[PDB]
Write a protein that binds this ligand. Structure first.
Ligand SMILES: Nc1ncnc2c1ncn2[C@@H]1O[C@H](COP(=O)(O)OP(=O)(O)O)[C@@H](O)[C@H]1O
Ligand SMILES: [Mg+2]
Length: 280
């Protein structure tokens, strides 16, 4: 489908850059007619059919369709879409407190309570998405933004729907691959993928939250990928010796090779701890 083709600069003023991707750049912006602030994501379009620069129209349309469906406190929303010959421009809800990735860098490691306060929001957002048969396929700390990083209990939003897909048959087989440290073994092995791939990523994120260390990270992307397929991780005593056994149990039930045997989003919410690009 087609998007608004008026000059986006007629309607918005842009400011600081918020983030950068392979073929996307995200800039703070202000809508002229309301004075409200947004994040404008400029996605470079493919210049030819066969090209490897830019994002295919099919992929952009899929990201926009998915964004248009979502309205939940723990996920980003889509305000408007514009386009011109070079880019598609998504006007997204602004999340102004930075990435969970940078918050973690400025903290080195969280307590179980700080970890579970983030985790419960992430699980709620993922529950919403999975309820809608949307697999995110790129869950990692850089794709989890804080509304405000200077409150004791920050609120979060899941961002970056660039790899997300509807799963109509319980699995899809269209060649998806995110960041080696966070991808599930079925991604590594090029097998049919479903909602369970997100649950593995959640296990990786949880491990990092608790320890400040990445459970499968090797010295090269290929070594990480090998570690993932083999489920080559362990709870280092130096990091986890004073972490509860229930926290370890939650992680152990997510970092499971067979997606059929991995906890679902609904199981994760009822778990006792909780219940109240690939190539070098
Ligand atoms: N809605 C937003 N609010 C604030 N920052 C954002 C927002 N969306 C993206 N960013 C920043 O821009 C970076 C790149 O955007 P992203 O959607 O992750 O694109 P891609 O993975 O295609 O590069 C993010 O990691 C984040 O730092
Ligand atoms: Mg991203």
């Amino acid at each position: 489908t087609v998007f608004r083709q008026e000059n986006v600069d007629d309607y918005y003023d842009t400011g600081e850059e918020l983030g950068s991707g392979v073929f996307a750049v995200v800039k703070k912006c202000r809508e002229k007619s309301t004075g409200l602030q947004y994040a404008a994501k400029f996605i470079k379009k493919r210049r030819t059919k066969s090209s490897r620069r830019g994002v295919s129209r099919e992929d952009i349309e899929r990201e926009v369709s998915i964004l248009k469906e979502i309205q939940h406190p723990n996920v980003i929303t889509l305000h408007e879409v514009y386009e011109n010959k070079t880019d598609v421009i998504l006007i997204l809800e602004l999340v102004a407190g930075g990435e969970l990735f940078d918050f973690l860098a400025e903290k080195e490691s969280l307590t179980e309570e700080e970890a579970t306060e983030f985790l419960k929001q992430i699980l709620n957002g993922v529950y919403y998405l999975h309820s809608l048969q949307i697999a995110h396929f790129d869950l990692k700390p850089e794709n989890i933004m804080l509304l405000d990083r200077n409150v004791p209990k920050p609120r979060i939003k899941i961002i970056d729907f660039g790899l997300a897909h509807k799963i109509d048959f319980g699995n899809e087989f269209k060649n998806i691959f995110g960041t080696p440290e966070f991808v599930a073994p079925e991604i590594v092995n090029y097998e049919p993928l479903g909602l369970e791939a997100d649950m593995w990523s959640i296990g990786v994120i949880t491990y990092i939250l608790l320890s400040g260390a990445s459970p499968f990270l090797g010295d090269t992307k290929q070594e990480t990928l090998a570690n993932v397929s083999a489920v080559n991780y362990e709870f280092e005593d130096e990091y986890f010796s004073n972490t509860s056994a229930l926290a370890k149990d939650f992680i152990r039930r997510l970092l499971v090779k067979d997606p059929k045997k991995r906890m679902t989003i609904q199981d994760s919410l009822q778990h006792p701890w909780i219940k109240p690009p690939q190539f070098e």
